[PDB]
From a paper:
Here we describe a new mechanism by which foot-and-mouth disease virus (FMDV) can become resistant to ribavirin. Amino acid changes in the viral polymerase, selected by ribavirin, are able to modify the types of mutations produced in the presence of ribavirin. P44S but not [name] was detected in a 70% proportion in R-Ap35, as evidenced by analysis of both the consensus sequences and their corresponding mutant spectra. These results suggest that the three substitutions in 3D were selected sequentially during replication in the presence of increasing concentrations of R: first M296I, then P44S and finally [name]. To identify possible structural modifications of the viral polymerase associated with the important alterations of the mutational spectrum in progeny RNA, and to investigate how these modifications can affect RNA binding and polymerase activity, the different mutant 3Ds were incubated with the heteropolymeric sym/sub-U RNA of sequence 5′GCAUGGGCCC3′, crystallized, and analyzed by X-ray diffraction.
Two different crystal forms were obtained; the single mutants 3D(P44S) and 3D([name]) incubated with sym/sub-U RNA crystallized in the tetragonal P42212 space group. The RNA molecule appeared mostly disordered in the two structures. The X-ray structures were determined to 2.2 Å and 2.6 Å resolution for 3D(P44S) and 3D([name]), respectively, and to 2.6 Å and 2.5 Å for 3D(P44S, M296I) and 3D(SSI), respectively. Subtle domain movements, in particular a ∼1° rotation of the thumb domains relative to the fingers, were observed between the unbound, tetragonal, and the RNA-bound, trigonal structures when the individual domains were superimposed. As a consequence of this rotation, the active site appeared more closed in the unbound state. Thus, the changes observed seem to be a consequence of either RNA-binding, or of the different packing constraints in the tetragonal and trigonal space groups or both, but they do not seem to be related to the presence of substitutions P44S or [name]. Finally, no significant structural changes were observed associated with substitution [name]. Finally, P169 is a non-conserved residue located in motif F of 3D that has been implicated in the recognition of the triphosphate moiety of the incoming nucleotide. P169 is close to 3D residues that directly contact with either the triphosphate or ribose moieties of the incoming nucleotide. However, we can not exclude that a change at this position could also affect the recognition of an incoming nucleotide, modulating its incorporation rate, and thus altering the replication fidelity or replicative fitness.
Numbering used by the authors: 1 to 476
Write the structure that this text describes.
Amino acid sequence: GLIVDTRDVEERVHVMRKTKLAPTVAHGVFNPEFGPAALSNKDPRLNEGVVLDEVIFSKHKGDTKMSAEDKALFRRCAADYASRLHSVLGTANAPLSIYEAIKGVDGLDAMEPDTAPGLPWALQGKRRGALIDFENGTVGPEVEAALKLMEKREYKFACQTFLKDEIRSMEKVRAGKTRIVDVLPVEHILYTRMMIGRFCAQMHSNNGPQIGSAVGCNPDVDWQRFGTHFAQYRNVWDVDYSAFDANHCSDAMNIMFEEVFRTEFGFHPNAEWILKTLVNTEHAYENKRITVEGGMPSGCSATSIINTILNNIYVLYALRRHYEGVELDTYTMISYGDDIVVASDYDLDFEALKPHFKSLGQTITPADKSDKGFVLGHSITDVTFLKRHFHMDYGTGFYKPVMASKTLEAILSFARRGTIQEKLISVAGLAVHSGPDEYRRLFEPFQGLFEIPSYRSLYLRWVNAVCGDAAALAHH
Ligand SMILES: [Mg+2]
């Protein structure tokens, strides 16, 4: 986005500056070129001269202003996508009640009861429990008053900046490229869910190439569904964005919200309004208040879905700006936020699409970065989606999601204190698709120290998950 205003106020917003992540027994074996991000300015690992709270906001390099003709094309692509989207999902997008927003419905998980509350509740020293009863799905006096303010459309707020405690590549750790979570007030998250929660549940349930969304998918079972779909196309592209979230221009965000969340699609009018409050934001970090115009915040209860919607419209936009007679069935795509796989039977010149994405403020590069950019003739087995490859399991004939060994090694090299046993079982769920030999090697350092699930047990669990009848039949 565009930093338009920076001022200092006499009230500090304290941030988490001590890492919860610690090395495991695997760190000594795998020696990964990875580590926890910098949470302090005076981290000894940082390049001696880097200022942490200048790199974390360096992503804000402006807010691209689109011309009239480009805006008119964007609205047309947004409307056509909304058309396809609501054709599949339906028009049952009536507001969720206070109770349903807290407890969640079928397709939407409950609100997290213990996570960060937001502002100004963090200054009052109040946890999420003091504001909202998560047991009974009711609200206290504080949230109640704010929800009434959101109905009148007079509610203003601040975003709280947290440093993301996570594993990052040593080059990024050393360069101070720590990511940030923009924690929004708990009432905003609740009300956003109230306004578009029903829509979000439907998008999770109906995920796939038809709506262009993988939000709500389980890669274990859905990789077969996705793989066989993209295997039928002549050309497949692996597209990468740089700073996808921050580079959403105000024009693109406003027009999208207007075209997708219309009342005629079954939405409450306030659905559009609450999403538009994400466009111009104020961010609180220590003594500094930074006003940003444009870009998506990280902590909205629908960032993945909003990002995914924009991604779909960007592809439609860029192709229509370059070629004539381009429709939704000219190509096919799956998206999860910034992550994207595109396919077509047409020889689409994606290299030529670069400045067309630039008119939206977005920069595209091929994932498997090779000489002279994007190339034709790539298939589904060549690409990466959600950090997973599309490999054929030769025992069943189904596509399996395979993560790279370096990534698995990195994930296994660090954990929060006391969570190791739970993390191991979870990562084993991902490591099973790498095969018996790699699986065994990856969990070698943990043997005798923790319970490691047998490859056999997890393989059989998977076969039934993807196709019950197959595992039923495999007993012929
Ligand atoms: Mg990718």
